[PDB]
């Protein structure tokens, strides 16, 4: 009849949630301890985390099958981070991490297909099979870096470009507790502070007062199992850098399941029903199967593109193979 | 009896530790049962925290620590998890270790061993596949060895630990689990391979083929294919990158009149470029019936996709091809 | 009019900065009037803190910073005070910059220039005298240039800034204050030297002599001594270490039938080892009337004492000696 | 007559002095704020500092004359440090620093002659002219290191040997405020703390809360212009490491003259006379002139030893010179 919106539904539109208070380092006032979730955002976050979760379980299956080779670092259990982080920033903001990057490649906008197909080393991977698990790039996503600690000065340098370019963008630079003793991290803290770079240094602490290791740089310690906690901390941190106050450290603690926590929140406050969420699960599974089928059916890239993309913006040239008689065309 | 390359290195370190209390091992996960590539397995249980020492992920720092301990008279085995990671610590290797005995006028020796896998592995992509033989081999004050088989690795690791200067031992992760029959003389705790000497692995009359590390076995397989056609390859296992055994190479080329060098690392300014240059500079140049040629890895960062990777390292077929090209057959 | 090499580089950076707002300069003391080797003098006054940026003594960190800024689309000139110090940052140069466009499948370019003096200076001893031409030149994904004179340095620094990939520019501290007459075409803000092309500095018929950086002038002085005896040297200024201009070299050797390579850096796995290997692999081998030979620095850490230092770098007399040995005269 | 010691003199044998209190980082109790000086020690410290001072002024003269080449870093004005430090440790303890090392080479036992002759690059230098200003070694002195920051992990590794060897020796590892941002310094702090290494990390601050940069490692800030202050801080720090408590940081502030301060102390408390001290000055000047004459008259080392000492404990071998026809003998 048209008198009520076709999208009108039965549920609450929003609910207010309590989120854990962050421990603070050199900040008088941290992020709020309540936040508002909209039905629309909750369904979004729930679908995204669930997709990362099923993608990573699928990758592990393929890996055990020897279809993925070399490294295959997974972020299952950590979905509140990549999704939480994505939720507190803009698409025009920037993010870099180390090798545990499948989730961020997804939240930054690559399809499950491109991600799995790169893992299985096929021409339909996001790098046509040149990079594999550790080296994937996306829009304002800078990898996907295999040398532990190396991404942190990269991140600080992306943040210097943010400041240089004048568009109020910020950079989120992630590292794991394993890398927190890299000396180049402290070099980056010092230059970031000195230049007031909009760099959110983030330590993904899986399970040692990391958020205080920036010393002069302020820190917050956050519950990385709670997408809402991660979202608010991120918003606070991004707004901190955007105001011109310089860098800040965020320690995300992970180890209870982040998807289940959101699910219970959504059902108990009647933002969504058990049934809606099950149907999302069903659709997510289909997306992951289509992607896995394509990743395993897709051919390897052709041998004649072996030497492609050594240099950007150059005329074509020839690269030598295993002997001087083997020559590969290199095209930018 | 058969012993894996991994087990041979482990025998060598075990024996050198037992034999001298000043020897210790340090690096990431060296004290853990699993344990990098399991090369140090069992050592911690036998020798404890004092001597088998896990480090944080701090390459420049723990390599500098290892070098200072050598300066102070101890005898560190410093494990890089791969040599790719040695790049973070490379100033310690070159400026603090290599150059020090010289700059000090013979006063300050540096009895340190840097060891760990070097070069290509399987599917680990461009940041984890780099060969450092030419890089290290270029440097005065270093010794640089590159074992192929179980004997090479036990005997060079023992010589390295006994040397009183910085020795880079470039191992091979694909070679670790490869078993070789281990003669009684290699089984002995007395077993040493002198640094600076090549091994002729196969005698031959038609062509000299020189390699190091894992491609050596590819060189031996190419040779076996080739003898079925009446082509006898003399296969030479370099063992030492610096000071390399050029006289062994020259003697062979003066007999066979032809040379192919084979390596895994990148071609330009690589190991074969030096061997070629020396051949051209010395007494064997006049014995060449054909120019010498190089088999190498492809001149790319290592790609991930298996087909691409397979075609980025020298294969037995690439070796045979090169050899036939040189013999014009 | 005469312009020092130092002033030529400074012209090139000034012009490239003026021409593109995304170009910036960063490194230790680049904004200070005195000022490393004074190569950036005046720039800060003209361009301010935003664009000329002093860093703390944190090589790995500020080189990584420079690389990330290039990834983000900016165009950094990253100055190493000397290349000796680049060793602390070398993983950033190789693993973060060189390899990235490839590993990313052409998605992530890295428009960064690393520049600063390389090789021997005067009395600065073993830790401050190392030549990195072969080391960098070995690496896929890098371009590596080595200017000798004022023209070389202005034109290569401008090409380097315009390239969209990691370019290592290996300058020379002894060359900075050396004045050269500067043609009007070099004076122009439009002046570029294509990367990958050698220059024939002196035409000749009897011998090909190939060099890079400062020894080039030693090669030209040796040539002038030599023509007084009816020996005409063709002197070739490489300019680019990777991708080197081998066709220019081969063409020359096919004309002169003889080759000496001359470099400052260590001999083993050095620049001449590659040139020698390529000569032996390509079309010019059959045009050799004599094997090719290498003039290099001595195979030692650089000693301090002046006499020792003088005898650790190639001299005009060492070049002449090598050339006469090859021509057998 | 023999009834009184021939060495009997007119002066006090000892006096008690007030020394500046150290700022403390994570220590409840610092070094004492008084100390006893003996006449004998005072005369010793006074002669040592005065010798360093005149040696460095002499080096500067020779440098301006172009007789010294390359680098020539001086420690004049900082004599309370190398002498103060020497005074708080044993000869069996260990010390490393960067390139500003002439004073420590002296206090660790090399003669002015060997030091100047290495500077002027002659065969009588302590390294026969192979090393020059930056690379001098001595007994339990490990340079004399030209790459800023590189000596700090070296120092920590010497300290690991101290702990390993079980003889209660300690290592003093010095770096300048210029290097205090080197990432390998923080790597060394962390490993030193983790292993409880007897490493006294020392920041020579010439003129930014450096003694606190070890974070978890305790620190003290010391008056580096007062030899007595440096001596007591050092004793405290060495005794700290010797007790098995692990590493500690000492920031020595320098900029009033340290020799004059000791002189006034000695005269006012009648530990020594103006005249005794002037006669020391006279003798010091003679020592520096003999050393400078020898350093400038001594010949360069012979060309045939160019390639000597590449490797320790090896048979002799040949090294190549600028062409393949130039061969240098190398002997260990
Ligand atoms: Cl699924
Ligand atoms: Cl005097
Ligand atoms: K050894
Ligand atoms: K293996
Ligand atoms: K560029
Ligand atoms: K100059």
PDB file of N, CA, C and O in Angstrom, chain A residues 51-110:
ATOM      1  N   UNK A  51      32.696 -12.939   8.157  1.00  0.00           N
ATOM      2  CA  UNK A  51      33.392 -13.207   6.901  1.00  0.00           C
ATOM      3  C   UNK A  51      34.913 -13.438   7.073  1.00  0.00           C
ATOM      4  O   UNK A  51      35.463 -14.404   6.525  1.00  0.00           O
ATOM      5  N   UNK A  52      35.596 -12.531   7.789  1.00  0.00           N
ATOM      6  CA  UNK A  52      36.974 -12.761   8.206  1.00  0.00           C
ATOM      7  C   UNK A  52      37.145 -14.139   8.884  1.00  0.00           C
ATOM      8  O   UNK A  52      38.040 -14.914   8.506  1.00  0.00           O
ATOM      9  N   UNK A  53      36.286 -14.453   9.852  1.00  0.00           N
ATOM     10  CA  UNK A  53      36.388 -15.713  10.608  1.00  0.00           C
ATOM     11  C   UNK A  53      36.344 -16.903   9.636  1.00  0.00           C
ATOM     12  O   UNK A  53      37.272 -17.683   9.596  1.00  0.00           O
ATOM     13  N   UNK A  54      35.291 -17.008   8.823  1.00  0.00           N
ATOM     14  CA  UNK A  54      35.148 -18.111   7.824  1.00  0.00           C
ATOM     15  C   UNK A  54      36.231 -18.081   6.730  1.00  0.00           C
ATOM     16  O   UNK A  54      36.775 -19.117   6.359  1.00  0.00           O
ATOM     17  N   UNK A  55      36.597 -16.895   6.253  1.00  0.00           N
ATOM     18  CA  UNK A  55      37.758 -16.836   5.362  1.00  0.00           C
ATOM     19  C   UNK A  55      39.051 -17.474   5.963  1.00  0.00           C
ATOM     20  O   UNK A  55      39.748 -18.255   5.282  1.00  0.00           O
ATOM     21  N   UNK A  56      39.360 -17.166   7.226  1.00  0.00           N
ATOM     22  CA  UNK A  56      40.596 -17.636   7.847  1.00  0.00           C
ATOM     23  C   UNK A  56      40.500 -19.136   8.128  1.00  0.00           C
ATOM     24  O   UNK A  56      41.446 -19.854   7.893  1.00  0.00           O
ATOM     25  N   UNK A  57      39.332 -19.620   8.529  1.00  0.00           N
ATOM     26  CA  UNK A  57      39.180 -21.063   8.729  1.00  0.00           C
ATOM     27  C   UNK A  57      39.345 -21.779   7.375  1.00  0.00           C
ATOM     28  O   UNK A  57      39.846 -22.894   7.297  1.00  0.00           O
ATOM     29  N   UNK A  58      38.916 -21.122   6.305  1.00  0.00           N
ATOM     30  CA  UNK A  58      38.938 -21.740   4.992  1.00  0.00           C
ATOM     31  C   UNK A  58      40.368 -21.811   4.531  1.00  0.00           C
ATOM     32  O   UNK A  58      40.824 -22.882   4.075  1.00  0.00           O
ATOM     33  N   UNK A  59      41.056 -20.668   4.631  1.00  0.00           N
ATOM     34  CA  UNK A  59      42.507 -20.595   4.363  1.00  0.00           C
ATOM     35  C   UNK A  59      43.246 -21.712   5.101  1.00  0.00           C
ATOM     36  O   UNK A  59      44.111 -22.336   4.530  1.00  0.00           O
ATOM     37  N   UNK A  60      42.911 -21.965   6.358  1.00  0.00           N
ATOM     38  CA  UNK A  60      43.604 -22.992   7.097  1.00  0.00           C
ATOM     39  C   UNK A  60      43.360 -24.372   6.496  1.00  0.00           C
ATOM     40  O   UNK A  60      44.282 -25.188   6.432  1.00  0.00           O
ATOM     41  N   UNK A  61      42.126 -24.627   6.051  1.00  0.00           N
ATOM     42  CA  UNK A  61      41.790 -25.886   5.381  1.00  0.00           C
ATOM     43  C   UNK A  61      42.651 -26.134   4.144  1.00  0.00           C
ATOM     44  O   UNK A  61      43.222 -27.210   3.972  1.00  0.00           O
ATOM     45  N   UNK A  62      42.711 -25.111   3.299  1.00  0.00           N
ATOM     46  CA  UNK A  62      43.473 -25.096   2.034  1.00  0.00           C
ATOM     47  C   UNK A  62      44.955 -25.265   2.306  1.00  0.00           C
ATOM     48  O   UNK A  62      45.643 -25.996   1.585  1.00  0.00           O
ATOM     49  N   UNK A  63      45.445 -24.591   3.350  1.00  0.00           N
ATOM     50  CA  UNK A  63      46.829 -24.739   3.811  1.00  0.00           C
ATOM     51  C   UNK A  63      47.151 -26.170   4.231  1.00  0.00           C
ATOM     52  O   UNK A  63      48.160 -26.725   3.802  1.00  0.00           O
ATOM     53  N   UNK A  64      46.309 -26.774   5.073  1.00  0.00           N
ATOM     54  CA  UNK A  64      46.528 -28.168   5.464  1.00  0.00           C
ATOM     55  C   UNK A  64      46.513 -29.080   4.232  1.00  0.00           C
ATOM     56  O   UNK A  64      47.121 -30.181   4.231  1.00  0.00           O
ATOM     57  N   UNK A  65      45.798 -28.644   3.184  1.00  0.00           N
ATOM     58  CA  UNK A  65      45.722 -29.435   1.960  1.00  0.00           C
ATOM     59  C   UNK A  65      46.928 -29.210   1.094  1.00  0.00           C
ATOM     60  O   UNK A  65      47.006 -29.839   0.044  1.00  0.00           O
ATOM     61  N   UNK A  66      47.862 -28.355   1.539  1.00  0.00           N
ATOM     62  CA  UNK A  66      49.077 -28.009   0.790  1.00  0.00           C
ATOM     63  C   UNK A  66      48.756 -27.181  -0.467  1.00  0.00           C
ATOM     64  O   UNK A  66      49.582 -27.035  -1.338  1.00  0.00           O
ATOM     65  N   UNK A  67      47.570 -26.594  -0.546  1.00  0.00           N
ATOM     66  CA  UNK A  67      47.196 -25.757  -1.695  1.00  0.00           C
ATOM     67  C   UNK A  67      47.732 -24.361  -1.506  1.00  0.00           C
ATOM     68  O   UNK A  67      48.124 -23.693  -2.461  1.00  0.00           O
ATOM     69  N   UNK A  68      47.748 -23.901  -0.270  1.00  0.00           N
ATOM     70  CA  UNK A  68      48.521 -22.721   0.080  1.00  0.00           C
ATOM     71  C   UNK A  68      49.938 -23.170   0.488  1.00  0.00           C
ATOM     72  O   UNK A  68      50.103 -24.147   1.198  1.00  0.00           O
ATOM     73  N   UNK A  69      50.972 -22.491   0.003  1.00  0.00           N
ATOM     74  CA  UNK A  69      52.355 -22.831   0.400  1.00  0.00           C
ATOM     75  C   UNK A  69      52.974 -21.733   1.300  1.00  0.00           C
ATOM     76  O   UNK A  69      52.413 -20.619   1.415  1.00  0.00           O
ATOM     77  N   UNK A  70      54.115 -22.056   1.938  1.00  0.00           N
ATOM     78  CA  UNK A  70      54.921 -21.047   2.658  1.00  0.00           C
ATOM     79  C   UNK A  70      54.212 -20.629   3.928  1.00  0.00           C
ATOM     80  O   UNK A  70      53.781 -21.472   4.721  1.00  0.00           O
ATOM     81  N   UNK A  71      54.033 -19.329   4.104  1.00  0.00           N
ATOM     82  CA  UNK A  71      53.393 -18.824   5.299  1.00  0.00           C
ATOM     83  C   UNK A  71      51.873 -18.723   5.131  1.00  0.00           C
ATOM     84  O   UNK A  71      51.337 -18.481   4.029  1.00  0.00           O
ATOM     85  N   UNK A  72      51.159 -18.835   6.237  1.00  0.00           N
ATOM     86  CA  UNK A  72      49.748 -18.541   6.191  1.00  0.00           C
ATOM     87  C   UNK A  72      49.304 -18.088   7.593  1.00  0.00           C
ATOM     88  O   UNK A  72      48.826 -18.910   8.411  1.00  0.00           O
ATOM     89  N   UNK A  73      49.549 -16.807   7.903  1.00  0.00           N
ATOM     90  CA  UNK A  73      49.252 -16.333   9.235  1.00  0.00           C
ATOM     91  C   UNK A  73      47.774 -15.964   9.295  1.00  0.00           C
ATOM     92  O   UNK A  73      47.243 -15.221   8.424  1.00  0.00           O
ATOM     93  N   UNK A  74      47.106 -16.465  10.322  1.00  0.00           N
ATOM     94  CA  UNK A  74      45.672 -16.201  10.479  1.00  0.00           C
ATOM     95  C   UNK A  74      45.330 -15.243  11.635  1.00  0.00           C
ATOM     96  O   UNK A  74      46.012 -15.201  12.672  1.00  0.00           O
ATOM     97  N   UNK A  75      44.256 -14.482  11.445  1.00  0.00           N
ATOM     98  CA  UNK A  75      43.755 -13.616  12.470  1.00  0.00           C
ATOM     99  C   UNK A  75      42.423 -14.098  13.074  1.00  0.00           C
ATOM    100  O   UNK A  75      41.697 -13.303  13.670  1.00  0.00           O
ATOM    101  N   UNK A  76      42.079 -15.377  12.974  1.00  0.00           N
ATOM    102  CA  UNK A  76      40.821 -15.777  13.586  1.00  0.00           C
ATOM    103  C   UNK A  76      40.889 -15.583  15.088  1.00  0.00           C
ATOM    104  O   UNK A  76      41.869 -15.905  15.699  1.00  0.00           O
ATOM    105  N   UNK A  77      39.834 -15.048  15.678  1.00  0.00           N
ATOM    106  CA  UNK A  77      39.815 -14.737  17.100  1.00  0.00           C
ATOM    107  C   UNK A  77      40.094 -13.260  17.266  1.00  0.00           C
ATOM    108  O   UNK A  77      39.816 -12.692  18.329  1.00  0.00           O
ATOM    109  N   UNK A  78      40.635 -12.628  16.238  1.00  0.00           N
ATOM    110  CA  UNK A  78      41.001 -11.230  16.348  1.00  0.00           C
ATOM    111  C   UNK A  78      40.132 -10.297  15.514  1.00  0.00           C
ATOM    112  O   UNK A  78      40.512  -9.161  15.248  1.00  0.00           O
ATOM    113  N   UNK A  79      38.943 -10.749  15.138  1.00  0.00           N
ATOM    114  CA  UNK A  79      38.125  -9.986  14.218  1.00  0.00           C
ATOM    115  C   UNK A  79      37.634  -8.649  14.755  1.00  0.00           C
ATOM    116  O   UNK A  79      37.323  -7.756  13.976  1.00  0.00           O
ATOM    117  N   UNK A  80      37.591  -8.484  16.075  1.00  0.00           N
ATOM    118  CA  UNK A  80      37.153  -7.202  16.688  1.00  0.00           C
ATOM    119  C   UNK A  80      38.117  -6.079  16.409  1.00  0.00           C
ATOM    120  O   UNK A  80      37.724  -4.885  16.299  1.00  0.00           O
ATOM    121  N   UNK A  81      39.378  -6.476  16.202  1.00  0.00           N
ATOM    122  CA  UNK A  81      40.445  -5.557  15.779  1.00  0.00           C
ATOM    123  C   UNK A  81      40.337  -5.012  14.361  1.00  0.00           C
ATOM    124  O   UNK A  81      40.171  -3.807  14.172  1.00  0.00           O
ATOM    125  N   UNK A  82      40.443  -5.879  13.338  1.00  0.00           N
ATOM    126  CA  UNK A  82      40.430  -5.340  12.007  1.00  0.00           C
ATOM    127  C   UNK A  82      39.102  -4.694  11.728  1.00  0.00           C
ATOM    128  O   UNK A  82      39.043  -3.613  11.134  1.00  0.00           O
ATOM    129  N   UNK A  83      38.024  -5.308  12.199  1.00  0.00           N
ATOM    130  CA  UNK A  83      36.699  -4.687  11.974  1.00  0.00           C
ATOM    131  C   UNK A  83      36.443  -3.444  12.837  1.00  0.00           C
ATOM    132  O   UNK A  83      36.013  -2.389  12.335  1.00  0.00           O
ATOM    133  N   UNK A  84      36.742  -3.556  14.130  1.00  0.00           N
ATOM    134  CA  UNK A  84      36.707  -2.427  15.090  1.00  0.00           C
ATOM    135  C   UNK A  84      37.508  -1.240  14.578  1.00  0.00           C
ATOM    136  O   UNK A  84      37.043  -0.104  14.564  1.00  0.00           O
ATOM    137  N   UNK A  85      38.724  -1.516  14.117  1.00  0.00           N
ATOM    138  CA  UNK A  85      39.602  -0.470  13.607  1.00  0.00           C
ATOM    139  C   UNK A  85      39.007   0.145  12.375  1.00  0.00           C
ATOM    140  O   UNK A  85      38.992   1.365  12.245  1.00  0.00           O
ATOM    141  N   UNK A  86      38.536  -0.682  11.439  1.00  0.00           N
ATOM    142  CA  UNK A  86      37.948  -0.140  10.235  1.00  0.00           C
ATOM    143  C   UNK A  86      36.767   0.801  10.582  1.00  0.00           C
ATOM    144  O   UNK A  86      36.575   1.907   9.993  1.00  0.00           O
ATOM    145  N   UNK A  87      36.027   0.384  11.587  1.00  0.00           N
ATOM    146  CA  UNK A  87      34.843   1.119  11.988  1.00  0.00           C
ATOM    147  C   UNK A  87      35.185   2.486  12.589  1.00  0.00           C
ATOM    148  O   UNK A  87      34.366   3.414  12.492  1.00  0.00           O
ATOM    149  N   UNK A  88      36.389   2.655  13.156  1.00  0.00           N
ATOM    150  CA  UNK A  88      36.741   3.986  13.753  1.00  0.00           C
ATOM    151  C   UNK A  88      37.466   4.946  12.835  1.00  0.00           C
ATOM    152  O   UNK A  88      37.855   6.091  13.233  1.00  0.00           O
ATOM    153  N   UNK A  89      37.648   4.518  11.581  1.00  0.00           N
ATOM    154  CA  UNK A  89      38.413   5.353  10.626  1.00  0.00           C
ATOM    155  C   UNK A  89      37.659   5.488   9.317  1.00  0.00           C
ATOM    156  O   UNK A  89      36.661   4.785   9.094  1.00  0.00           O
ATOM    157  N   UNK A  90      38.185   6.367   8.466  1.00  0.00           N
ATOM    158  CA  UNK A  90      37.642   6.632   7.176  1.00  0.00           C
ATOM    159  C   UNK A  90      38.330   5.806   6.085  1.00  0.00           C
ATOM    160  O   UNK A  90      39.500   5.377   6.212  1.00  0.00           O
ATOM    161  N   UNK A  91      37.650   5.649   4.949  1.00  0.00           N
ATOM    162  CA  UNK A  91      38.358   5.021   3.857  1.00  0.00           C
ATOM    163  C   UNK A  91      39.575   5.825   3.370  1.00  0.00           C
ATOM    164  O   UNK A  91      40.474   5.215   2.768  1.00  0.00           O
ATOM    165  N   UNK A  92      39.585   7.160   3.566  1.00  0.00           N
ATOM    166  CA  UNK A  92      40.737   7.967   3.171  1.00  0.00           C
ATOM    167  C   UNK A  92      41.914   7.940   4.208  1.00  0.00           C
ATOM    168  O   UNK A  92      42.978   8.496   3.973  1.00  0.00           O
ATOM    169  N   UNK A  93      41.707   7.320   5.364  1.00  0.00           N
ATOM    170  CA  UNK A  93      42.795   7.052   6.300  1.00  0.00           C
ATOM    171  C   UNK A  93      43.606   5.873   5.811  1.00  0.00           C
ATOM    172  O   UNK A  93      43.222   5.231   4.828  1.00  0.00           O
ATOM    173  N   UNK A  94      44.747   5.586   6.493  1.00  0.00           N
ATOM    174  CA  UNK A  94      45.761   4.690   5.969  1.00  0.00           C
ATOM    175  C   UNK A  94      46.048   3.607   6.998  1.00  0.00           C
ATOM    176  O   UNK A  94      45.990   3.859   8.181  1.00  0.00           O
ATOM    177  N   UNK A  95      46.370   2.401   6.576  1.00  0.00           N
ATOM    178  CA  UNK A  95      46.703   1.364   7.572  1.00  0.00           C
ATOM    179  C   UNK A  95      47.823   0.445   7.041  1.00  0.00           C
ATOM    180  O   UNK A  95      47.859   0.067   5.846  1.00  0.00           O
ATOM    181  N   UNK A  96      48.762   0.099   7.931  1.00  0.00           N
ATOM    182  CA  UNK A  96      49.778  -0.877   7.589  1.00  0.00           C
ATOM    183  C   UNK A  96      49.928  -1.812   8.776  1.00  0.00           C
ATOM    184  O   UNK A  96      49.722  -1.391   9.910  1.00  0.00           O
ATOM    185  N   UNK A  97      50.279  -3.071   8.528  1.00  0.00           N
ATOM    186  CA  UNK A  97      50.512  -4.038   9.611  1.00  0.00           C
ATOM    187  C   UNK A  97      51.672  -5.011   9.197  1.00  0.00           C
ATOM    188  O   UNK A  97      52.367  -4.773   8.206  1.00  0.00           O
ATOM    189  N   UNK A  98      51.862  -6.135   9.865  1.00  0.00           N
ATOM    190  CA  UNK A  98      52.903  -7.047   9.369  1.00  0.00           C
ATOM    191  C   UNK A  98      52.240  -8.125   8.532  1.00  0.00           C
ATOM    192  O   UNK A  98      51.506  -7.815   7.620  1.00  0.00           O
ATOM    193  N   UNK A  99      52.430  -9.402   8.876  1.00  0.00           N
ATOM    194  CA  UNK A  99      52.072 -10.435   7.906  1.00  0.00           C
ATOM    195  C   UNK A  99      50.693 -11.054   8.148  1.00  0.00           C
ATOM    196  O   UNK A  99      50.194 -11.811   7.305  1.00  0.00           O
ATOM    197  N   UNK A 100      50.109 -10.778   9.322  1.00  0.00           N
ATOM    198  CA  UNK A 100      48.838 -11.370   9.722  1.00  0.00           C
ATOM    199  C   UNK A 100      47.754 -10.446   9.178  1.00  0.00           C
ATOM    200  O   UNK A 100      47.047  -9.812   9.950  1.00  0.00           O
ATOM    201  N   UNK A 101      47.670 -10.335   7.851  1.00  0.00           N
ATOM    202  CA  UNK A 101      46.973  -9.235   7.210  1.00  0.00           C
ATOM    203  C   UNK A 101      45.680  -9.625   6.446  1.00  0.00           C
ATOM    204  O   UNK A 101      45.084  -8.762   5.812  1.00  0.00           O
ATOM    205  N   UNK A 102      45.241 -10.884   6.487  1.00  0.00           N
ATOM    206  CA  UNK A 102      44.108 -11.285   5.612  1.00  0.00           C
ATOM    207  C   UNK A 102      42.858 -10.476   5.992  1.00  0.00           C
ATOM    208  O   UNK A 102      42.048 -10.109   5.126  1.00  0.00           O
ATOM    209  N   UNK A 103      42.709 -10.230   7.295  1.00  0.00           N
ATOM    210  CA  UNK A 103      41.499  -9.579   7.785  1.00  0.00           C
ATOM    211  C   UNK A 103      41.520  -8.168   7.293  1.00  0.00           C
ATOM    212  O   UNK A 103      40.522  -7.706   6.766  1.00  0.00           O
ATOM    213  N   UNK A 104      42.656  -7.477   7.463  1.00  0.00           N
ATOM    214  CA  UNK A 104      42.736  -6.078   7.013  1.00  0.00           C
ATOM    215  C   UNK A 104      42.631  -5.928   5.513  1.00  0.00           C
ATOM    216  O   UNK A 104      42.245  -4.881   5.020  1.00  0.00           O
ATOM    217  N   UNK A 105      43.032  -6.946   4.764  1.00  0.00           N
ATOM    218  CA  UNK A 105      42.882  -6.826   3.341  1.00  0.00           C
ATOM    219  C   UNK A 105      41.400  -6.815   3.054  1.00  0.00           C
ATOM    220  O   UNK A 105      40.926  -6.060   2.205  1.00  0.00           O
ATOM    221  N   UNK A 106      40.674  -7.690   3.736  1.00  0.00           N
ATOM    222  CA  UNK A 106      39.211  -7.694   3.612  1.00  0.00           C
ATOM    223  C   UNK A 106      38.580  -6.372   4.103  1.00  0.00           C
ATOM    224  O   UNK A 106      37.825  -5.781   3.401  1.00  0.00           O
ATOM    225  N   UNK A 107      38.910  -5.896   5.298  1.00  0.00           N
ATOM    226  CA  UNK A 107      38.157  -4.756   5.824  1.00  0.00           C
ATOM    227  C   UNK A 107      38.535  -3.512   5.006  1.00  0.00           C
ATOM    228  O   UNK A 107      37.838  -2.511   5.009  1.00  0.00           O
ATOM    229  N   UNK A 108      39.663  -3.569   4.311  1.00  0.00           N
ATOM    230  CA  UNK A 108      40.124  -2.394   3.526  1.00  0.00           C
ATOM    231  C   UNK A 108      39.598  -2.544   2.099  1.00  0.00           C
ATOM    232  O   UNK A 108      39.725  -1.647   1.266  1.00  0.00           O
ATOM    233  N   UNK A 109      38.974  -3.669   1.782  1.00  0.00           N
ATOM    234  CA  UNK A 109      38.155  -3.640   0.551  1.00  0.00           C
ATOM    235  C   UNK A 109      38.454  -4.655  -0.547  1.00  0.00           C
ATOM    236  O   UNK A 109      37.888  -4.569  -1.629  1.00  0.00           O
ATOM    237  N   UNK A 110      39.355  -5.601  -0.294  1.00  0.00           N
ATOM    238  CA  UNK A 110      39.620  -6.666  -1.254  1.00  0.00           C
ATOM    239  C   UNK A 110      38.610  -7.772  -1.043  1.00  0.00           C
ATOM    240  O   UNK A 110      38.124  -7.957   0.075  1.00  0.00           O
TER     241      UNK A 110
END
